[PDB]
Amino acid sequence: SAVQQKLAALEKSSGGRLGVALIDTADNTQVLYRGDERFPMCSTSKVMAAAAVLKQSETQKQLLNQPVEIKPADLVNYNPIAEKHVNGTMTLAELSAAALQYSDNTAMNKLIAQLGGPGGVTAFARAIGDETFRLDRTEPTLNTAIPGDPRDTTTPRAMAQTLRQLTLGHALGETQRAQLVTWLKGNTTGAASIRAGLPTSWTVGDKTGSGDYGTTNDIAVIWPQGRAPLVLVTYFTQPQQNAESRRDVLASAARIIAEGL
Numbered sequence: 001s002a003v004q005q006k007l008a009a010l011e012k013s014s015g016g017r018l019g020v021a022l023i024d025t026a027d028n029t030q031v032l033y034r035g036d037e038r039f040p041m042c043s044t045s046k047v048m049a050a051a052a053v054l055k056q057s058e059t060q061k062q063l064l065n066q067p068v069e070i071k072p073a074d075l076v077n078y079n080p081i082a083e084k085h086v087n088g089t090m091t092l093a094e095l096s097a098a099a100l101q102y103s104d105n106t107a108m109n110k111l112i113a114q115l116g117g118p119g120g121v122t123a124f125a126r127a128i129g130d131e132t133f134r135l136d137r138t139e140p141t142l143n144t145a146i147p148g149d150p151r152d153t154t155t156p157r158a159m160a161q162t163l164r165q166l167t168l169g170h171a172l173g174e175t176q177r178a179q180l181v182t183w184l185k186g187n188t189t190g191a192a193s194i195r196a197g198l199p200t201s202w203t204v205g206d207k208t209g210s211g212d213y214g215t216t217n218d219i220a221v222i223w224p225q226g227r228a229p230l231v232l233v234t235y236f237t238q239p240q241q242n243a244e245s246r247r248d249v250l251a252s253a254a255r256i257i258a259e260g261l
């Protein structure tokens, strides 16, 4: 289609490898570009860790208010929020919000620990029918994004379907789902990515990701004003280990998708 031609041309212009999956919940149609290829998730994996804890809170009604101690040893490479609470505590809700809205790596590692390790995050994926998602490492090493390395990867198709279920479907309880949507809508790191390719009137909840090999990711739920919502996943990675982030590519891919709806 016209859109796949333009996405292919965008990819060629960028020098990297682009993965796109759009789900139009209006008619359940899908637009895929390298939709079944594996990409490093980087911090887009934090959505799965947060959703897994949310699922736990369906039975442990007070779980999200459980305080968790932040020790100096817990601090890794990027902890904008956890930094503010060293030698203090953060609730599991505050850590979930920090992981999603500020991409705090210490917060993500606490969520993984709460779930019993990376295997616990991956287990949740399988429980909701995602057989592609795999989380193998903790922060920060899950961002190495080595070409061909299957660790800590998923496919755009798989992530789009799963994000739909978590935010628009009923993989989570009603209150948990709404909390996840609220967190995603208040993301602070996505202004230059998918959001930048879309009309300013559209409401967007997203989670960005970045890592080595210039890996630049964004996954988003989109609520156009007066229209069925959309799920859009954009994954991008490059052949040089030290390549710069290319959020402009994500914005351009979203703009190309928006043209047509």
Ligand SMILES: *[B@@]1([O])O[C][C]([C][O])O1
Pocket (backbone or CB within 6 Å): 042, 043, 044, 077, 078, 103, 105, 140, 143, 208, 209, 210, 211
């Ligand atoms: B994720 O990918 O988003 C930011 C941090 C950087 O290490 O991880």
